[PDB]
């Protein structure tokens, strides 16, 4: 009220590890329990699945040539796999870039390619745009 | 060889002053130009910095404007006295008030009619608040070196009452902090202190003893 500063309570615990670590822990604890549901992709995954194919996709990117320093560019429209890519690129430490697809042309695409200078381009063929 | 060139330049100066080639505004190139108007002649006159140091008059911070309107001709017998007080106040305190307050915009007008009642319009930082219009009321027992200070006191208390009447000051405060600089058109001759900006600004620095 008197001065401009605002603070929240500090009693809440803070998680400082990597992402893959909590994925492994949560995969050991609840293995068969559901993680995400998607009807339009027919995706019903457990924590089993998310761990398994997260690091599987990580290896996939490793053999596709990705390295811990460089970037990925991803234009995918509301899939599960952009999240999976979040985890995969987290595991190999590559910076993932997610750009909005709702207004996309050649010019700003080549702007993104100029900016991030990605190793990979995660794209579509037919994408749905308003 | 500085002395004779100096002489040369002085005689040259007086020559152009007799023949009307002399531009008195050259030091002032970077400043915006005040209103060319029938009452605002208090603006174009180059003010010594010393008598601006002499008249230090502050009003309430919530004042944004002071207008002084007076009739060119006064039909009324006492009309002349009122006009003279208004004229004197418009010439003596309008520029200084502006100078020190710096958010207050000050304008005087010579409006051409026979009317004996000059008035002063005070605006506060509220847009929603009506301006206060104070009449000039010379008492017939008061000369023109006294009544002017009386009008000054009236303007000060008017601005103060106008500023303490303000709906919530949070708004007025931020509007005040962000209101741009109003005293830019003032032309000041800095005499014996012109050498660096810090004594150009010397009227800002105030010594506070016994804190």
């Amino acid at each position: 009220k008197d001065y401009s500063v605002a603070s929240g309570s500090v009693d809440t615990p803070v998680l400082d590890q990597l992402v893959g670590y909590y994925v492994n822990i949560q995969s050991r604890k609840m293995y068969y329990k559901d993680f995400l549901r998607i009807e339009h992709q027919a995706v019903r995954w457990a924590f089993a699945d998310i761990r398994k194919n997260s690091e599987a996709l990580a290896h996939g990117l490793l053999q596709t040539g990705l390295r811990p320093g460089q970037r990925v560019l991803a234009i995918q429209p509301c899939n599960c796999e952009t999240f999976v890519l979040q985890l995969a690129c987290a595991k190999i430490g590559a910076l993932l870039a997610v750009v909005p697809h709702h207004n996309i042309s050649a010019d700003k695409l080549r702007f993104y390619l100029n900016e991030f200078q990605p190793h990979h381009l995660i794209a579509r063929e037919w994408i749905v745009v308003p | 060889s500085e002395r004779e060139a100096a002489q040369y330049k002085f005689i040259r100066r007086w020559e152009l002053q007799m023949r009307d080639e002399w531009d008195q505004l050259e030091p002032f190139k970077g400043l915006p130009k005040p209103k060319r108007q029938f009452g605002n002649e208090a603006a174009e006159v180059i003010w010594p910095y010393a008598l601006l140091l002499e008249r230090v008059v502050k009003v309430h911070p919530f004042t944004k404007s002071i207008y002084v309107y007076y009739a060119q001709r006064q039909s009324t017998a006492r009309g002349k006295l009122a006009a003279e007080i208004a004229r004197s106040f418009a010439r003596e305190f309008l520029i200084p008030i502006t100078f020190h307050n710096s958010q207050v915009y000050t304008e005087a007008e010579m409006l051409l009619e026979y009317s004996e009642t000059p008035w002063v319009v005070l605006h506060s930082l509220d847009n929603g608040q009506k301006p206060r219009i104070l009449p000039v009321a010379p008492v017939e027992g008061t000369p023109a070196h006294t009544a002017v200070e009386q009008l000054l006191a009236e303007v000060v208390q008017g601005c103060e009452a106008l500023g303490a009447s303000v709906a919530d000051p949070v708004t007025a405060t931020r509007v005040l902090n962000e209101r741009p600089l109003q005293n830019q058109y003032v032309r000041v001759d800095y005499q014996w202190f012109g050498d660096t900006p810090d004594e150009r600004a010397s009227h800002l620095v105030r010594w506070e003893f016994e804190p």
Binding site: - | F38, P48, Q72, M110
Partner: protein, 44 residues
């Protein structure tokens, strides 16, 4: 104050003529052109 530089002396001169001729610095002398209305309101 004895000025050891010429500009020091014009400073001295300026404060001096602010002191001795002070009638120069009263507002009526600043207003010599207006003892009346503005100069364009006149006759020829």
């Amino acid at each position: 104050e004895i000025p050891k530089t010429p500009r020091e002396y014009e400073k001295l001169l300026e404060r001096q003529r602010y002191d001795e001729e002070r009638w120069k610095y009263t507002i009526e002398y600043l207003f010599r052109k207006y003892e009346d209305g503005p100069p364009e309101l006149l006759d020829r």
